[model samples]
Target: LAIAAVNAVTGEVDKLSDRVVALEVAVNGGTQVAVREFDMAAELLMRQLLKLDGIEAAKVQRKAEVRRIQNLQEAVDKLKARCS
Candidate 1:
């Protein structure tokens, strides 16, 4: 459920970003703001999900999840700053 929510929001962001980029929209800033909000929420959800797994030593398990979520958050933040 968490992953689905994240993916839905991510898909929306991707669509908006692509549309704005292709159309040269004047308010890409607004789309980026929405992306940042979604990214932050997804990061929190992912963190909670990671904490629930009890499988010990699953070969960089926690590391991978944390990195992936953080990377997504970073991309959102970067886009927010870059959007004009």
Candidate 2:
């Protein structure tokens, strides 16, 4: 490919990550007073913890973590049963 073409493609695709953060749906407000004034520097931080909140693991991740809790639960149950 041409140099300009490669640069353009890279530039556009680089925006993809920003697009992902944006697609996660986190946003805004405005005002006048000192309290009305807000800086997204922290607002962006507010939901930096958002998406993962209701999100689930997948893409080879699920199988890894799922059985752990299941086995832990069963083991605990057996231990309790054995206690009696």
Candidate 3:
């Protein structure tokens, strides 16, 4: 029963993560203020993910790190573009 509930929440978090990735990408071209806010949100999400139990047990548990990476990836992508 608890697994079922966790799975449901996991799915929700998965969707939120996907949206955050898109936001990260969008924030790449946005003002510094907006990017900073997104960065903050990403950090919060990452912290939550790291503090959660069973995060390393499966792919489903990776949503947090994946989302965090996507944010970092976006920043890197933008920086590379700027350097080029």
Candidate 4:
């Protein structure tokens, strides 16, 4: 009885590990797709803004500009996360 229980538990653990691996693969694939879709657009927008905001006297300072910059930063961070 003890040996049977051990075997059953071991089998369950094996199934669980397989499920975990499948889940990880799916998740990584989805993440890669998202990063791929967002990567170039985010980079382009950041660069475009930098060309404007990069100037000290021409810095954007409106409320909308602040919000836009914040949202852009979040997208940039997400892109960076894909690498690490």
Q: What Cα-based lDDT does every candidate model obtain?
A: 0.47, 0.33, 0.52, 0.45
Per-residue lDDT of 24 in model 1 = 30
Against the hidden reference, what TM-scores do the models get?
0.37, 0.32, 0.39, 0.36
Candidate 1: residue 50 Cα off by (Å): 6.9
By TM-score rank, best first, the candidates go 3, 1, 4, 2
Residue 71 lDDT in candidate 4 = 62
> What is the C-alpha local distance difference test score of candidate 2?
0.33
Q: Supply the global lDDT for candidate 4.
A: 0.45
Model 3, 1-84: lDDT tens per residue?
A: 434544554565566567566664664667333445455555654544554444434455455445655565465456444434
lDDT of 2 by residue, 1-84 (tens): 233433333343334334333422332122122311122322332232232233443424333333333443343344333333
- Which residue pairs in candidate 2 have backbone atoms (N, alpha carbon, C) closer than 3 angstroms, thus clashing? none
Query: What is the clash tally of candidate 1?
Result: 0
Candidate ranking (lDDT, best to worst) = 3, 1, 4, 2
Can you tell me which runs of candidate 2 are displaced by over 4 Å?
Answer: 1-53, 56-58
lDDT of 1 by residue, 5-27 (tens): 44443454445445434333433
Candidate 3 clash figure, as a count: 0
Model 4 steric clash pairs: none
Q: How many residue pairs clash in each candidate?
A: 0, 0, 0, 0
| Candidate 3: residue 41 lDDT (0-100) | 50
Sum up the clashes in candidate 2.
Answer: 0
RMSD to native for every prediction? 7.5, 18.7, 5.6, 22.0
